[PDB]
Symmetry: none
Subunit: 187 residues, 2 copies
């Protein structure tokens, strides 16, 4: 008389439902064997499991005896391992969230106040003058919740498409203005 084996089901969970006390329907099969010992059938099972809120990524939950049938012995256990889903805007890094902050070059140079999204509502982040590409601007009070974490606005500089006659001239003049700038001092 030996016990059954443990099953594992990786449950993907949209980050947004992190603080959501959520219900997932789990479905799995338990194999049924021949007198000659091979599978010949699978019995289908389902449970409506109440997943607690604020389940951290990769965290584990145990449903005892929901695993494989024991031999002769107790059933094995079933494990639901969480895997927080890849957010469209935010990105889980540590206990904090990251948001890429697209900025037009003028916006980065002059500075600008622009609305940025959070978990729920949208705050107003201010960008200092002269900010650089890769700039890691922090916004406290908006981040993973449980205490609560912080969001980081990581600046990325974007460009409009090819410019028309007038916008061109201007660019040539900045080019002239900033002719001394070496964007590749590293090489």
């Amino acid at each position: 008389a030996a016990r059954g084996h443990d099953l594992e089901i990786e449950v993907a969970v949209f980050l947004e439902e992190t603080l959501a006390e959520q219900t997932r329907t789990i479905s799995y099969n338990l194999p049924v064997y021949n007198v000659f010992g091979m599978i010949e059938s699978e019995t289908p099972k389902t449970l409506n499991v109440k997943i607690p809120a604020g389940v951290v990524d990769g965290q584990r939950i145990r449903l005892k005896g929901q695993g494989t049938p024991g031999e002769n012995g107790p059933n094995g256990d079933l494990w639901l391992v969480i895997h927080i889903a890849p957010h469209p805007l935010f990105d889980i890094v540590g206990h904090n969230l990251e948001i890429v902050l697209p900025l037009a070059p003028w916006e980065a140079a002059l500075g600008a106040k622009v609305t940025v999204p959070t978990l729920k509502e949208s705050i107003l982040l201010t960008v200092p003058p002269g900010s650089q590409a890769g700039q890691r601007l922090r916004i406290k009070g908006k981040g993973l919740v449980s205490h609560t974490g912080d969001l980081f606005a990581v600046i990325k500089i974007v460009m409009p498409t090819k410019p028309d006659e007038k916008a061109r001239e201007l660019w040539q003049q900045l080019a002239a203005a900033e002719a001394s700038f070496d964007p590749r001092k590293t090489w």
Copy 2:
């Protein structure tokens, strides 16, 4: 009625070296355990032609070339192409961050770009974009029968705080391109 012991030998290569077959001379040490189971180290040297296209971690085995009452052990050559400070490998291809000033992307330029071998002058067309991939054919890795390319991936970079002049032109710019919405995606 015993048998042999094995050996792992790290063999450091450089990304540039990988571009062609290279004859190499590895010096190592062959252990000596007393007929117990260590107090000596009879060294050796082998001359091997490493092939064009190897990859970090790759292993080449040499038979019998380990310790020696029956069959001898085996020798393991573990390649170790430690990380290059400019080119990131992506299969048979290479990637390089190409810093550009906002006005280089806007106006379009010609920029000298490095290579595993020798530099090349790259044409950045007017209107280029953050994250854009400019292809440099054949400057990627040389696998057995294929040769990858190198991609210069644009990254707009800005200078430090500006001044009356710069700042005045940036304001004009903003007006000229007032319709542009970087955060369209929000």
